Amino acid sequence: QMGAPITAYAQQTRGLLGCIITSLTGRDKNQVEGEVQIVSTATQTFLATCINGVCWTVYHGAGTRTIASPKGPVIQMYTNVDQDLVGWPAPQGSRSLTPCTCGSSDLYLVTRHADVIPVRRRGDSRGSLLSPRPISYLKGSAGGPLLCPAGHAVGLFRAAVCTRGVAKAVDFIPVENLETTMRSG
Amino acid sequence: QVEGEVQIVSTATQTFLATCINGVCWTVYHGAGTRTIASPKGPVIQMYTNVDQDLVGWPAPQGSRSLTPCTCGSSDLYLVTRHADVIPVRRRGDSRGSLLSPRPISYLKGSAGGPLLCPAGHAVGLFRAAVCTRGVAKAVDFIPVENLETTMRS
């Protein structure tokens, strides 16, 4: 692989109207590809990351919603309001990332525009942008992955740390919280 | 239409690479010289010419995309060849890097002007020349992105 070097591309698969209809029916026949899915509700759009066969995203984006699938709506396998996590089984066709095991502190955040931005880990759930960006550049990226140099999942982007519309750091959900969530359940 | 950051270019005598960074399509002077670049509307003249840094640039052509410069300072580089091969390179200095696994010189041939990327896929520099020992490339000379930025500011 996912890194060395990390590169990403985005592809749009559904328009506004199609999204609404699919949201109501809960039946999505579109083919799936990739590690990260760009997802949307009626009020917002964000990201969902596949890790170890599970499609994870932020609770603040997905709430308790089901996910549209070829077989109709799919209920979440995991839910953790306190940790701001939700997980569904990874859609057929998707590819999963695997958790980081190298403990690196040099992270790379993948945006909804498929840009890769370097992030220096400063704590369990925070990292600073090497080069700050306007908050608009990060909008709709929550639920997206923070990868280590080897392209393995270190955490999921939760919220930016802004000051005057400028993102200087990011709060993220470390992979560890995913395990804790899966055991809770 | 899919866009590329890297162009495979050629003159009547040689073939090499060009990389788009910051709206500019850059390459090596030793390859392009003072030449213009072709376009559907005729020749386009160089925007920049830096013989000393062995650098030249034209406006980014159609079907291209600009690559972001590296700002992480990593020493783990990755050189992209004209064949789309990725060569891991360890940064040894401002404009120098050693291949993790040496390659026959032919493997790098025609790649000058191509990019050296960091772990984030950003531009650390442009491949300038292979450093060879009896037909084996063990290191590379490159133009740091900083030089590109400087050239523009000029």
């Binding site: 591309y9 559904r14 590690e35 919603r65 089901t66 | 064949h83």
Partner: peptide, 23 residues
């Protein structure tokens, strides 16, 4: 009930540098 979350796109990290095929 509420409506479903819907996949409207995807981001692919597994792609490697490639020469763009000439149509």
């Amino acid at each position: 009930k509420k409506g479903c979350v819907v996949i409207v796109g995807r981001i692919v990290l597994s792609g490697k540098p490639a020469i763009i095929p000439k149509k």
